[model samples]
Target: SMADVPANLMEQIHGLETLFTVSSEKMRSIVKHFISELDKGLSKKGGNIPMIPGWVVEYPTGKETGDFLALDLGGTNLRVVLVKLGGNHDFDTTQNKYRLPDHLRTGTSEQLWSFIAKCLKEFVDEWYPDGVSEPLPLGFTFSYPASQKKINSGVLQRWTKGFDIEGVEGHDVVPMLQEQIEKLNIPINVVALINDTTGTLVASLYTDPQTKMGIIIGTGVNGAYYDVVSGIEKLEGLLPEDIGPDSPMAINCEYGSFDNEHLVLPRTKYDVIIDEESPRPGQQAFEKMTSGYYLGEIMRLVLLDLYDSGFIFKDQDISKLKEAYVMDTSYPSKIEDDPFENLEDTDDLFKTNLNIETTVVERKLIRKLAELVGTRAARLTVCGVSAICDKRGYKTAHIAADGSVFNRYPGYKEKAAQALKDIYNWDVEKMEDHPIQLVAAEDGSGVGAAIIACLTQKRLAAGKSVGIKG
Candidate 1:
């Protein structure tokens, strides 16, 4: 039967399947090692790293009248939120989203910050016409790699998400932004600097006490978790004498950089080529395969290769398939949602976007390709989550996942759930009865930023150290 199939077709199918199997296995190993490293790093008895501080969901009991500003600077856009904190854990919030300017997206550090400062100034001048008499406190959500000194300070580790701004690496970014804010005369103080993952965790916890882990699966993949000081061995010398060994702290797993050996990640020729040609070679191997930024491109490459080999769309103008920009993540999403069992969306996409008519079989092949890639990504994601649960002894706990991919993609959530079930051998009926659950978390970063600000203000008012342990 194997010999009866066309050799080329069989090879293509085998290649894709092999890539998925390798990737899935690699993902499992990577997660296992990452969790072990995190545990080792947090083994110091009584340290300041706050590896896993279990903070309970306390209502904002402070003067909830003042408005707090939150800024989420993520991959494609800058989101600003103005929240009017009301009494008894209630607040009226409004938000504005702006596309990051093209120049800033690829510009120098000074130019980017200056542009951001100008935007902030403009927003304030237009929205708060009476002049912000009181200096507004802000929670800046900087979605990049950084090592935090405290809740309010973080040193830039490196730039990611396609940003290569020089002079920013290995520097404190809060003061830099503060300087720009001062120059602009905008009376906004950077009270807290937080990773979007941290914000998501805090926000999810605020709404649901069961929320323990926060993950960002868009643009790139990374996670942050809470740990106790007693578990961190690397910071034993840095801790003070008064603190106990079990103090909690947060650890940014930065799992994207996991397992550079590529022992577990399935790397096809195309994956290897993509890695070799990447701006940061040999990095984010898992992220490259799974995240929103690269999946569409992966599909694009596969189709192009098939086209070139005369396996797909033979005798067509194959000229249009040459460009990377023609196919994007949205295209895959559209293809995934095509309603026609006969693969009508494939035809529609080819005819509308590429100006080519696709035959029924071609459409069928496209659908199969998209499903294969999507399923692999979704399944691989669960490996990381399963590892987290195993490390934390959270056999039965809820995970509030936030991101466009998790929220928007059809069957993505179910696929991840199934993967986790498969990994843990969870009985579906019993899982419903257990404490462990994975539920959708809404606007976690925004809500979490507000909650942190509330806690900080309360500690300041009481004249106490703003440190609380799990």
Candidate 2:
């Protein structure tokens, strides 16, 4: 069987393994760079990573009880959730998800907000036919880049995820939605605007007190963590009279833009190609390497290179494979998760997806390739989590993670755990006893948003500042 394989093919596979491998020493070094970049992001003059200050200054005491409305505006779907928060980490949610069409995503801001406003109106009418006594506090999870100085406001930075609506960029999104709601005369008050990462952080803390950070590794990679207000140097004149340096504040670390200057973090030719070909080049460099969104494209590029080199799929037309992002993370996940030694799943995938047949040796190489890409992604993601822990001086902490990559990708969690061991120099025998742990996260957009909305009201009721001026 070994004699059947071509030397050139085997050599290419080995080269890829080396290219994608993230050694223990490399992980440690990259994390050091990550910590420094985080510091730069938090400074008054920001760095590559935008360490945006989340106006949420408090955490749930696990005693916050309330009924609230939560809206999750993500890349694909707009979810309207009615959440009933019962303390003790118990909550009930009734929700509806509306698919966003291409026109609305690229249309005017008025059309987008009007559609959302109508959906909210319809949801309210169905839920409360008799009408409510007062306006219900709503928490909006706007999953986009924005500048925020208060809990209930954000200025949209730019559109991502294929959205290019006019009159929305660089504008405060909350007031636009609020104006729509007022026009409809709905009984909903916009109290808090947050990101899914923040929701996951707050939501995780609600259920697990040990949760120190919330991370997302799905379409994009980002994180949020709680730290002392004093640690944020950029918040110099923004502190309230009653609040001190010790007050806890959540910081949204848009670490997707890490290593943009290429100061650290090893990059493969494939990574460079992916970034250059991306819609927004010179942006989301870290995300391009680590998140699920780009993993498939990386695989595609690798496969294309192999095909062009006349290594794998010799003489077969790979027109399907030439398309960008045609192969999603699921393809690599399936390849890695395939159970059979012969890799029947891999063969089937190639035949059906790419319309090409694969030999047993070719299948083996593909499997190895999938492992390399997936492992690198997990390892790089761990560096971000580890940097947060080290920066916060936490020898032991729990990280709550949500997203398809972390949850569904085969062996991704194990890879991350092993990388952590290597970085911390934990003995193999005591790997299970490592101090840092990555746990599955709960739904942040629904339960987390409702809880944050409740916390904002509690702050206002207690004569506490919810923002700098308050």
Candidate 3:
């Protein structure tokens, strides 16, 4: 009863299915390619991957107790969290969330950090009205592309996540934020600067000892894992023994930049559209195809082409359809989840969103479109996950992944898990026996900063420190 695709439209759907189809063998290639790219980055600076080190002082031992504050600057939200670690694998947090004003997203650094500093000052005022006798250690989590110069400083390589603030790249961001913090006089010491992925790893380790890696799959894509210092050839003479290439440390695999050469990933015309029109046309090629920021836009371009053919939504005024980003990633998810027999929910989706109507056939086609695209995204996501696992030779550790995509995308976790089984050539039950678990981490960066603060304070007290040099 659900036969609705026209001959030409049917051809288009089948073509997409064929183009985006990821075979089990292809999954292995992706993993292999991911590891290769990651290795290239670790050995050189100009490589496709940036494999930056995340100086996670130590993983949580489930017995860290302290009163610390965490400031997380993420793609969608800015959060301030006051954490009370109870020293027994449990903690309580008081926090506040501030939506990043859309206009300020593309604004200057001064405007951005000034707003952040204001919010921070207000939080400090509320918590310590009379001011604290001792400095409250704070961890500032900047979830962006940055290269660490020390535990407390990093150079912003280039902007991602749709931010294009000028005069910020190739410079340390800590001072920019610190200038504002100093102006605010908030008595909070910024002890650590951590990326979101590294945060996920450490935060997840607070409870689960098996966590050896972390990944962020929300508005962007990145990963972090503990790599021995000896493996990093790029740091031959750049590090001190205490903070040197010989020390085991966390490496942030800037995996979003995977396949910049364009030969590795199987890109379709849809991916080209997203890339050619992006701010950085030739950069972040993998993320363009697989991240939250681009998936809906990719679908939008496809629908636009189909609409011009008078195939779907024929004769309907789709004035709003031409707008950029009017369609969100969630739309595809909704279409994919809609019931097939009646398709009443998908019908409403079109009516509410595009303000137009769709025939039963159109609903079926639309669902197919989302299913194919979403499936490709899920599979591509597995490329990064399996890549990390493969690099480690299938270690028995949990991957602490944090993001809306991992948390909300239906069947995402299961699909990634399946890809791991294929890449490892293990059956589900067998893999479960050795068990590399993919887990969801909450407030990973914020909590990671707090935990790092605890470590920094301890190190400073012992007079053995790698950061905040006088």
Candidate 4:
């Protein structure tokens, strides 16, 4: 395969292939080790995985009707959503997205939450024009890792997605939010705090009872699934609620941080460079490769190698090409999804973004590069998905997955489905009953949060709020 290309270019391509390639047998090995990590994640004392407990009470019944609010705090934007449940597992939802100011990312805790509070007030002011409004139950999607004392309270363990607020870390984020919202007198009763990953699964389950796993692969990759309470040994003593062994609880695996133990993940030099330069370099090992957060940078590093080797833009201005994050993660998606017969979309991408004119062969190489990177992300993503199936002995399961990388990337779903087929050892032909089914969890996270908020408020009214404060 390497015979035809020039020596230098072939060497670089081979290097990329080395980093991205995964064999069927290699996947089996990765899945086996991955299941062990899932168990270790549930351990009581020491473990590499941080299997956080999702305090969502139970699944939503289609019959559950309510008007609730949901806020999704994500890497790029904060969404304020109002969901109207129709008591049939269907609902009407309207949301507004507010771009996060970069300065507040590492800014003071008070300033950050206060800004968020202002946004919430604005949502209410615009939506609820009649001034005498009832106290609305609010579901907060705190997509970062946290230590929870209740369903309505979570202490920020650390920030991800480029957030590093000083006082926010190691503090009860819910109280901070609650105080600010109340100060404005917006009349929002904070009822639930959730992760998008957890909400993804719960929302999936609301429609499909068989959905046991929910995954997010957009800005960063993470997952949640139903796990037996007995498996989470670490939280028994710490939990204020009496969660019995027979109980079922959703486990927010926070699996993005998987393989952070310096374990076997087939890391390449480019991965090393990504980790070393990342905000929390020794962390998010697997996510660095699979998630949208760093996909473009990985390809950039590869291209940089080509430029330095004099294969690309030789004696030309490569200044624009050398800029950090000049290429978004979507670049690969666009190239892979390139339309127009001459690779025109991709050709334009290069000219517009990097100001580099590429030959047909060069365009071909770049497309192949994007293809390889996208394939690697898809195949690696299934490791976690398969582990969820293998760990629970689920012979057949449905997963509701949400994320741009999973939904938008060309060939991602097929590649992941192929990985699951390989793991299940199912025959490709003559297969009607599949082992695992992956489908869209569209707005499942947001809706699920609202449902849980309704339930939490019910608990609060009943004075059954041991693990909740209304």
Tell me each candidate's TM-score. 0.83, 0.96, 0.90, 0.89
Residue pairs with clashing backbones, model 4 = 62-89
Q: Write the per-residue lDDT of candidate 1 for residues 1-470, one digit (tens) a residue.
A: 23344566767777777665534445566567756655644564422222333221233343456677787786678877777766544567778777888766567877777666777787778779889777877777886777664556667777767787888899878788888889999988777777777667666665566777777777667666566666656555555443346655555566665545577656678778778877778877768777877777777788888888778777677677777657777777788888886768778788888877777666766776777777778777667677777787886767768777787766687667766766655556654554455677646456556556666555456654433322
246-303 per-residue lDDT for model 3 (tens digits)? 4557777878889988987889887887788777899988888788777678778888
Better of 2 and 4 by TM-score: 2
| Highest lDDT model number | 2
**Least accurate stretch of 10 residues (summed lDDT) in model 3?**
461-470
Which residue pairs in candidate 3 have backbone atoms (N, alpha carbon, C) closer than 3 angstroms, thus clashing? Answer: none
Q: Rate the local accuracy (lDDT) of all candidates.
A: 0.68, 0.87, 0.79, 0.79
Report how far residue 330 has shifted in candidate 2, in Å: 1.6
Clashes counted in candidate 1 amount to 23
Once superposed on the true structure, which residue ranges of model 2 sit more than 4 Å away at CA? 1-7, 427-433
**Weakest ten-residue segment in model 4 by summed lDDT:** 461-470
Q: Where is model 1 more than 4 Å wrong at Cα?
A: 1-15, 21-30, 40-66, 85-90, 98-135, 161-166, 183-187, 240-243, 430-436, 461-470
Off-target runs (Cα >4 Å) in candidate 4 are: 1-15, 99-103, 125-134, 161-164, 237-242, 310-316, 340-342, 428-433, 465-470
| CA displacement after TM-score superposition, residue 198 of candidate 4 (Å) | 1.1
Candidate 4 lDDT over 1-470, as tens digits, reads 22345677667677778778888787888888889988987886646677777776466666878788998887778899998988786788888889988798878988888899999999998888785457999999997778776788888887776787787778888989999998998879888898888888887787777887998888878888988866777766554454556667777888877888767787778889889977687988878867876777878888888889778756656788677777888788888898655678888988887888877656667877888888777878888888888899887888889888878878787777876777678865633366686888957557878877876787678766335223
Clashing pairs in 2: none
Q: Against the hidden true structure, what lDDT does model 4 obtain?
A: 0.79
